[PDB]
Amino acid sequence: SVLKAFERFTIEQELQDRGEEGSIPPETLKSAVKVFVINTPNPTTRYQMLNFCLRIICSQNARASHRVGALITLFSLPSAGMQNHIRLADRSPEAQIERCEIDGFEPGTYRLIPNARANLTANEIAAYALLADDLPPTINNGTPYVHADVEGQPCDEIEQFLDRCYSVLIQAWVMVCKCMTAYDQPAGSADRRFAKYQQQGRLEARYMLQPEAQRLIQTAIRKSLVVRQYLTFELQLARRQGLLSNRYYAMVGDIGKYIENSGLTAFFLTLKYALGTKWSPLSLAAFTGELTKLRSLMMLYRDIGEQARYLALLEAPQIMDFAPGGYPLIFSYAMGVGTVLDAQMRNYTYARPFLNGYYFQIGVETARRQQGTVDNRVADDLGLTPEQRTEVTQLVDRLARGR
Amino acid sequence: SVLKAFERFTIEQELQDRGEEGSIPPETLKSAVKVFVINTPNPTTRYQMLNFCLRIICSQNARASHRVGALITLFSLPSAGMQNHIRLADRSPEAQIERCEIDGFEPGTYRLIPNARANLTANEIAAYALLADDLPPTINNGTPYVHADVEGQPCDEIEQFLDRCYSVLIQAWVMVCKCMTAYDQPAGSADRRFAKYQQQGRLEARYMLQPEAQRLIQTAIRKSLVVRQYLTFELQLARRQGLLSNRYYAMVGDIGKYIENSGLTAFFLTLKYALGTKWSPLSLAAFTGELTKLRSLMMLYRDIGEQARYLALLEAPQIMDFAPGGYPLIFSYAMGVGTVLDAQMRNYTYARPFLNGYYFQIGVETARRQQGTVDNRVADDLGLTPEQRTEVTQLVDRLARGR
RNA sequence: UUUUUU
RNA sequence: UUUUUU
RNA sequence: UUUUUU
């Protein structure tokens, strides 16, 4: 009937060439961003570079673009040829890299030596050195390193530098998974994930970061889109990798696994919990108007281009389509099943005003009732007899006590 | 029988070459609209330009065309090369852009310097400067900025300008979604949507707009078709974009998602709620005379050219075809189901005089009765037994209390 | 005719 | 809109 | 996250 037309209509509303678009945007005011490169593998140079960039991260009065450049440098230090990695950042718009080359710091504290190919102004060095010591008062020692001793210690061996740099890089990395989300919340979530890598040994607690620097890195990550684009490509490259790999990319991918779906949490939780745990209510003939939306949304996520696993991290209009408000009722039902099945999900926030309490209570009661609705054509694969089905349901009822 | 002829007839009534017409209209009295361009990326110049345009927005005695030009300039400031964007506005009729070029304001408050290529009259500068301070008495501080301090503060760095300009642009943008609709209503709807972006951080509350300026922008958007055409292309371009994008177009698309279907609300709500939630009544053999109309309307919306998602925003005769009055009875039924299922829809207005109360009450009773009409050939995909169907219906009945 | 919602 | 979890 | 066993 006309229902076929309605279904094709609803899908067509969701296929307005939104998924794949490999085109540039109209040009926009860029930001002159000054970035520095270390061609030689000198470990002392890169160590001083890491310390300098971390200083600039906490530079209180620094220009935003200065923080962007310091961040991009930081994320690019581990690379052998930093020229190539610096090049990749420019592949995105909003990138106007004033790529500079410094063979190394002067024997002064943070005084710099520009190289012949890429030079700068004397006022540049003066302002950068001024920016080198602007540190938050809440931070106790001048260094963000909590141990407050290693920053003084040098390293002339590539191995020691690699360990220190990897540790600091993962320090910064772990904060990404909470970028643009629950920033005002103190570090109640990352420490578990951080401590895991710590006792994995692939992290070092002897070189760790103070919480204030952590939150400053959080702020810088949110404020600067350039670093966001860079983190995207870094992670996209990491995923495509095989088993054998270097230390750094291996760690990056390992953390990125659950870094990815930082958003869509409502969507993923809803889809999983509802459309999987289909006991009683999913067939109601009143959820169709949202099931069509859900199917279209799945098609969207498949045909975005596999980058959708980073939609929240890359603030884009697609989230507005991936919105629970589009499908309030199935959302209510899924929240109902989740608040019963998991224990941690109880700690999750579901304060969307459009939520229908009626369907929410429907979900809760279905979860606490249908526990043990065995009978399926799938169930008969095991071959159990109906007497066995009754036995199973009764056994569930025995432990149903303790509510 | 003849019924085939009737159906083809009714569709043919709806296919009079109404959908796609890439042709110009007969020429009409245009409006000399004076617009200004800033080729250099100077941030102070563009900041002063933004302040000036916002002044002219609230210019009480200004010529309508003056407000049109100020608006178009405002919407075009973020672009790198504003020449190109100014060119696009002229692609529509009713566009007679007196495109002017000003390298920057004079050291006076708002005194202007025209450039050699595009000059004007001295009386032009005099009148524009006079128009610069005409401000509504209801506005407290001279500036529309509620904080009333940043307008004095300068900015010589492109980043600061970009942040300020984006914030102001979204300030203006969010009011578009209510253009030509519920204008007399105070800002009871936009604040939720605005505050969302605010705590998204992509907006800044430190630079926000007073409600009077908001309503003046509303008025200007309604009165001037040129800005409407410009907003259309801006949004049409935004939609076709891919994942990676600049800040500004990303925000524009993100808001435009639900900016789009600003009209057809009756149609979309009706089609969704009725033709989806088909429990009892949809098959009645008395809704056919409107179901044919509905199918034809769906074909119209598909074959308009995907721009139909902006039919209300682009006041066009097609709305008169997309009229509930064409299909009063299915409208009654859908309003009936909606007033039961959603809670917010209760706040919606459905005061069309042609509404049949009988079918409305039919819809209401069907919604409150058929809740839980499980049995479908689709329902059997889950494989539940009729005993399970009775269990589900009874369980719904248990929570049916609380009406 | 247009009036919520996300 | 975004808010756990691994 | 990883923690026996053969």
Residue numbers in the entry:
A (entry chain A), B (entry chain A): 3 to 405
What does the literature reporting this entry say, word for word?
N self-assembles into a helical capsid that accommodates the RNA genome to form a nucleocapsid, which protects the viral genome from host nucleases and serves as the template for viral replication. Both genome transcription and replication are carried out by the viral RNA-dependent RNA polymerase L and require the phosphoprotein P that bridges between the nucleocapsid and the polymerase. By obtaining atomic models for the authentic mumps virus nucleocapsid, we elucidate a concomitant conformational change that exposes the viral genome to its replication machinery. On the structural level, MuV nucleocapsids are templates for both viral transcription and replication.
